[model samples]
Target: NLYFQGKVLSEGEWQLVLHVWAKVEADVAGHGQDILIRLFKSHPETLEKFDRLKHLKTEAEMKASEDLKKAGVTVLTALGAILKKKGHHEAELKPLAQSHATKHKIPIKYLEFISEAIIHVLHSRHPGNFGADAQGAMNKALELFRKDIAAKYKELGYQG
Candidate 1:
């Protein structure tokens, strides 16, 4: 985890953040005022810690404005992409990417969402191609992301 950009932790610690991120998308959908305030309240030094760990400039840190919007959107987009490739809504997601961002007012989150969407779509079309290990894929991705990216970042696959 030394290579992780933001924070380092035992597997248990990483999983805690991941758990929150996965379960709380609507809670994280906005930007600029509320989210940052919340994160500062809850985790305190998370932003500073992230800066020290990522080697990213102050600008590269998760925008204090919108909070985990970008990260949550990223995972949903991945989910949409998976749905699309499975022929669920292939043509719709391009606009979906834009539409959801408009809903939350975070465009970067939208873009990240679509990228993950594409990956998801392919996976949907060929679930067997990736092995029966989707949950494992997500855990690893979430683990790496929490360590390297913004503190609010995360991934949760789906509910049913």
Candidate 2:
């Protein structure tokens, strides 16, 4: 019953995700800033949504912004919680999802964009360890996370 991206993950696939995540977890602990950097680089417009970060036009400025750094930490912390529970914590994410959908007015695609940044960071940081299988597992796990958030948005009647 472990569904991800509309597909049920086989037990072996789920175990592989957990195993791969465990290996990358420690390295990923402090790379939230890096993930945000990649995300902004790929989609600079996304940063404009954040009032505090919209003024940062340069990479150095973005890096030095305490608000941006704190936002990055929050992003990774949320992801950490999801991974720690193996994407079985929908109820826990509900309130956060509501805030994103209502208060922040965040688009669903931003979650996917962040997921891409996470994978990019891991791949760049650990080339040898992040092979296809590991990458696939990571992608699936994050997709599940995004799906959960999107479900909340739907519940709130947001057309994201």
Candidate 3:
């Protein structure tokens, strides 16, 4: 598969992913916002990609801003939906990758940070069955998410 890494996940892995997703879906917006906010904090240069937050002086202020919160929620909500449905719907990454490459002009390297940002949020906020096996499963799931987005990036012929 274009998105899968050599092999697709088993049914059990999909169920586990959805199980963890369900625990966090109720607060997806919040978790999403938190992930983006954390992203900006950890990588300040990436803040320039966000039109609204780029003008802000400090990370704290940006995190508090409604614009950042809304953008974060929008981006991650789409991501969560795609993950839950396992790409039955097109991954929202297509438009995001296209725009980020053409419109936003973000470097390809920084784009790789996305999965790290997500895993950070899931590790910190997802209060689900995040035990060892579940952690491995979730990590693999998000790895596929990363590769899926990267696949779109490559399809757009965006060079790293």
Candidate 4:
């Protein structure tokens, strides 16, 4: 049972989410770039957190950055994998959470920012398809992901 916002998602809702995600699965890299670019614009501080991106200040520079594109593709692929497993990959996520909590020293709030950016990108790019139901399902999925990461951080005794 996947819970989000204090409620469990029905199997049908999850199916809808998978179907919606499939629409953009073929162009993960392109969508990934859109999400990352939106994220950087909304929260410029996030750009500075990455060594490869900090040097590029302008949007044009960010768009031209191969490194940024690679980073986006990697993260989007990871996210797609998690969704494919239907959020049943806590063990796989623990090490990543640990790295962020310890090595990267990332605050938990960044996950929220990333989630927001992802949804924003989806909505902006596919306004007709990414309606209320799709948005809600994506929200629940991301909330579940965030909860798992937060649990890992808690286990590691990290305040964030």
Candidate 5:
């Protein structure tokens, strides 16, 4: 099975993700383009995915980019919906994974990197709990997401 079954987010783990997100929910939802912007800023090569983010230089420019907001909103909302409620949102990520692999032709590594980037974003935004437990839960969710993407990659004949 490609899915990560080693660790499931328990109440404690879920709460960890919840607390940090609660602290930054508005920013996370409203200005979530920063996550990918930060990622692309740190790893400019990853800019291959989106034209809107590719050309952007300053953080202010990236944050205000219209297309980036539109694109980042989907991911942020999905994470909020998944993290806010106390259940597995694995299914919610399916269509996203499929598209990332098939339609976008985004390599699985890029997807994986984004997963790591998300945790890094959260961890950077807040220390303490976001350090250990939040990362545990966030990592679990993203790893599972990567698995879903990987499965779709093979189904769609993606080499990576």
Candidate 6:
């Protein structure tokens, strides 16, 4: 049986997404690209060779890849400086989301909500949430992230 599911991403995008994920917090969508940029600056090797982040079309995406990569390098440098400093986790994360949201004119709350899911996955009981190697507890927090973040984002009336 093909247990069907729906997601915004296509296959193999997961790793790229996950790799890009390390740059920003989950609750903010606007900060996503910035986070990736930060990663590129700090860890060039970690950058994903993806261009489809902005455009759904393949050729367009490929054309954008190098630009994204270069921009990311600059962004990563700033991220590194921030990470080295200390502050409340959510405090730092939320602003990035808001900023990105404003820049992209996207609903910051929803993007943040999506990011929250990715966050929950990383914080799993085991490092990297290696279910196969551990007690098989994979992504139990997925439901919680999906439910709570969704509700919170919607509750704000699509703001915040």
Using lDDT as the measure, which candidate wins? 4
Mind giving the per-residue lDDT tens digits that candidate 4 earns over 1-160? 5543223556766776777778767787788889889989999888877887888878898889999889998888788877767767777788888888988888879889999999999988888898898899999988888888888898998978
- Candidate with top TM-score is 4
Tens digit per residue, CA lDDT, model 2, 1-160: 5545423555556666666666555655357778888999999878877887888888888778888878877777677777767657777778887888888888988888888888898888878778898788778878887887788789887867
Q: Give the local distance difference test score of model 2.
A: 0.77
Lowest summed lDDT across 10 adjacent residues in model 6 is found at: 133-142
TM accuracy, model 3: 0.79
Off by over 4 Å in 5: 1-7, 29-31, 82-90
Residue runs of model 1 more than 4 Å from their true location after superposition: 1-26, 30-56, 59-63, 67-87, 94-160
lDDT of 2 at 74: 76
User: Which residue pairs overlap in candidate 4's backbone?
Assistant: none
lDDT (CA) per prediction: 0.37, 0.77, 0.71, 0.83, 0.69, 0.37
Please give the lDDT score at residue 3 for candidate 5: 36
In what order do the candidates fall by TM-score, top score first? 4, 2, 3, 5, 6, 1
The digit string of per-residue lDDT tens for model 1 on 19-108 reads 433443334343222333334344444434333223323433544323344543554545433332322232444444344333333333
lDDT of 2 at 64: 83
Which one wins by lDDT: 2 or 6?
2
lDDT of 6 by residue, 1-160 (tens): 3432324333233333333334333333334344454333443333333333434234345335655545544444434333322211233444454443344334433333333433443344224543342221212223323334334444434443
For candidate 4, report its TM-score: 0.91
> Which 10 successive residues of model 4 have the least lDDT summed?
1-10
Q: Against the true structure, what is each candidate's TM-score? A: 0.22, 0.84, 0.79, 0.91, 0.75, 0.30
